[PDB]
Amino acid sequence: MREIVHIQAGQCGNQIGAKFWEVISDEHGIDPTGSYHGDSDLQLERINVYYNEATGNKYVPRAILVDLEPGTMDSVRSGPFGQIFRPDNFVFGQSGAGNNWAKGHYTEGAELVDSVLDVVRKESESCDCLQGFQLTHSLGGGTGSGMGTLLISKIREEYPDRIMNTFSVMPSPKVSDTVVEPYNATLSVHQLVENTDETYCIDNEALYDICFRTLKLTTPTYGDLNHLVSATMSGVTTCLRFPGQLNADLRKLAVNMVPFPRLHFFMPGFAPLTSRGSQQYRALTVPELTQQMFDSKNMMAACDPRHGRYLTVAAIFRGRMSMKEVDEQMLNVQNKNSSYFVEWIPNNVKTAVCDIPPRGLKMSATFIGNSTAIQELFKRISEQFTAMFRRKAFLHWYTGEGMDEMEFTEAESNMNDLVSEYQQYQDA
């Protein structure tokens, strides 16, 4: 277990995907042409997790870029790190998916999926020992959502003993493209519950509110939202990418974070919260990091941690700091809040440290929580689904592609089951 294969689908998927590669390439010393120009050995020791080595001697992301429309991917190609991607790994159709999960999953996506799997296969064949896959996508559109979940199901069929991991962007009325987002998200959640091992719930509601309430940006763009996403994504993958005292992979993450196979939707958090441009000079103390990383206002999923309990938590501290003081503060916050951590999983809070801080910071903390409070996210989507679905509003966009209302009823029931399955462990 060395190689991860990365897939990015649709507009959101490709935009957050491109930003992730910009950030991690910078962290690993890699420049737009693929050349290493860094000064630490820690940068290269585990670089094979994400990068292929061409005889070059160039580093090529193990990344496949997928869309049903060309626009966003042309934008990736002419973007900052655009030239670094293997040009054969751009797989795109022409028609788009019209924010329609049925188009992505059943009609338009079906037409393109085999050629994506061909590219997946070529990368997988070149792997010493493939860990599994990470997908970036949103759940509210058509391609990332319908076609992304189609890909996952086809990847699982061909590689049933590999790990599937997603970064899944949840829609919010606060940052909304179409009214059909809750339909697309519910259909997609149904898929994620069955076919991923671990999913980071990146909630556009939370990203918006952080940008507005905390970063004091009166009118957040997608760019501002994505600044938070890429910082979080860098953070959560630190222990996959860098050598440390705990050497992690996608399977060990899943084993230790997921006590029941359906409850695999993580609430990520980050501290210190910053924006692009105006950044703080004031350094953070270990007690301040720890306090901030656990604050509701630092979570990337709009749920109140106090309305539930943590099943498991992984925490990663980056920068030169006292590991002794880290351990003390982490233990302090558990011992002073222990009603919020289930008592039937001993040692359910795990901390790891990496010396390399992210760009522009002296120290940072990244949070990965499996909390029963995530049920709030799913309940919110469920309410929005039902508000339309009770009158069958907007359904003709889906029945026109050959779907039946039964399939909506089934995906709704499965998502409601998930919610009450969370409620079950919040009491005991």
Partner 1 sequence: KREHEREVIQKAIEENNNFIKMAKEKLAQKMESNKENREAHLAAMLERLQEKDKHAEEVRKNKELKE
Ligand X SMILES: Nc1nc2c(ncn2[C@@H]2O[C@H](COP(=O)(O)OP(=O)(O)O)[C@@H](O)[C@H]2O)c(=O)[nH]1
- Residue 180 binds to ligand X (criterion: CB under 6 A): no
Report the residue count for the chain: 428
Dihedral of the CA atoms 132, 133, 134, 136 (nearest 10)? -170
What single-letter amino acid sits at 82? Answer: G
Binding mask 9-38 for Mg ion (x = CB under 5 A): --x---------------------------
Using the contact rule CB under 8 A, the part of the chain among 163-171, 211-219, 259-267, 398-406 near partner 1 is 398-406
CB of 142 to Mg ion, least distance (A): 8
For 34, residues 6+ apart whose C-beta sits below 8 A from its C-beta are: 54, 56, 58, 59, 60, 84
Q: Which of 7, 63, 73, 97 binds ligand X (CB under 6 A)?
A: 97
Closest CA to 398 of 111, 149, 187: 187
- Residue 291 binds to partner 1 (criterion: CB under 8 A): no
- Residue 11 binds to ligand X (criterion: CB under 6 A): yes
Cβ neighbours of 273 (radius 10 Å): 18
> In terms of CB distance, is 27 or 181 closer to ligand X?
181
Q: Which of 202, 254, 286, 403 binds partner 1 (CB under 8 A)?
A: 403
Question: Looking only at residues 132 through 191 of this chain, which bind partner 1 when binding is defined by CB under 8 A?
Answer: 150, 153, 157
- Residue 106 binds to partner 1 (criterion: CB under 8 A): yes
CA distances 417 to 115, 169, 298, 376, 420, Å, are: 35, 21, 28, 13, 5
Q: Which residues of 198-207 are buried (b: 16+ CB within 10 A; e: fewer)?
A: bbbbbbbbbb
User: Binds 15, which of partner 1, Mg ion, ligand X, none (CB < 5 to 8 A, cut-off by type)?
Assistant: ligand X
Binding mask 194-213 for ligand X (x = CB under 6 A): ----------x--x------
Question: Tokens in use for 65?
Answer: 């870029």
What single-letter amino acid sits at 271? Answer: A
Binding site for Mg ion (CB under 5 A): 11
Binding site for ligand X (CB under 6 A): 10-12, 15-16, 97, 99, 138, 140-145, 169, 171, 175, 177, 181, 204, 207, 222, 225-226, 229
